[PDB]
Amino acid sequence: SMLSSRNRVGVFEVPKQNGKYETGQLFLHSIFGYRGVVLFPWQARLYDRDVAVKGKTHTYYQVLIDARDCPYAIPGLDYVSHEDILPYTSTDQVPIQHELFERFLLYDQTKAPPFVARETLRAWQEKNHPWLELSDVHRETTENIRVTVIPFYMGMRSHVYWWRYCIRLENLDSDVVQLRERHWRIFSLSGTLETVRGRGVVGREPVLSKEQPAFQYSSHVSLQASSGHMWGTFRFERPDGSHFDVRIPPFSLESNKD
Ligand code: NA
């Protein structure tokens, strides 16, 4: 979970233009303004319906969120785009507060960023990197509400399959809105078609103003099949009494590659 509200160390770098970020890069989320550290780069196909879907390779990052700006599925663990990263420099030998931080990074003033992969991390990257080939990135805009979805395959355990999903919601306008209802359609490979219509997202009814323009949450979906496609609508309410359905662009839930 995270809304956008306020921030508060370091020196600010220039966002990179023709280069990927390095393991150990400290950054603030350019939207949620948390303190984070880069773990490794990851190339995802991005299906952005707002070029008007011939998906283009785009550099994403697995990342550790500082536990002071927060409370497979590890708590401080998150994915951010290249654009999400405002890079910066500290000289704290502990710049990010998180249980995984020391396990993954050795401090060492030799190099920049000044934190190196503990080989605990290289094993982790090698373990995770395959499964992430199952994570495409979907984004579509309706009525100045931009939706981003990434599915992540959790594993399996009759035979049941688990995905988590990041959804981000962004008000691009100044007009105030609030998420009120979700209406999921989940269509399995079995030909089962589940549906879900309810108040809010994970307990929340987020208000999106240019004072708090963005919300990101994580939830999970279960099938009794190797694969399926999922899509739906969020219903938003305006102060003027009106309401509109923001499309969640279709994404896919996968287990095998070929
Ligand atoms: Na370097």
Per DSSP, what share of the residues sits in E-state strands of 2 or more residues? over 45%
Structural class: mainly beta
Instruction: Tell me the name of the CATH class of the domain at 132-253.
Output: Mainly Beta
Number of helices: 2
Radius of gyration: 19 Å
Compute the number of strand runs: 18
Compute the separation of the termini in Å: 34 Å
CATH architecture of the domain at 132-253: Sandwich
Q: What would you give as the CATH superfamily of the domain at 132-253?
A: ApaG domain
Give the biggest sheet: 11 strands, mixed
The rough form would be described as globular
List the bound ligands.
Answer: sodium ion
Describe the structure.
This protein is mainly beta and 258 residues long. It has a domain at 132-253: ApaG domain (Immunoglobulin-like). The protein is built from two helices and 18 strands. The strands form three sheets. Strands 1, 2, 3, 4, 5, 6, 7, 10, 11, 12 and 16 form an eleven-stranded mixed β-sheet that branches. Strands 13, 14, 15, 17 and 18 form a five-stranded antiparallel β-sheet that branches. Strands 8-9 form a two-stranded antiparallel sheet. It is globular and about 55 Å long. Bound molecules: sodium ion. Residues 22, 111-112 line the site of sodium ion. Its main location: mitochondrion. Keywords: DNA damage, DNA repair, Mitochondrion, Nucleus, Phosphoprotein, Transit peptide.
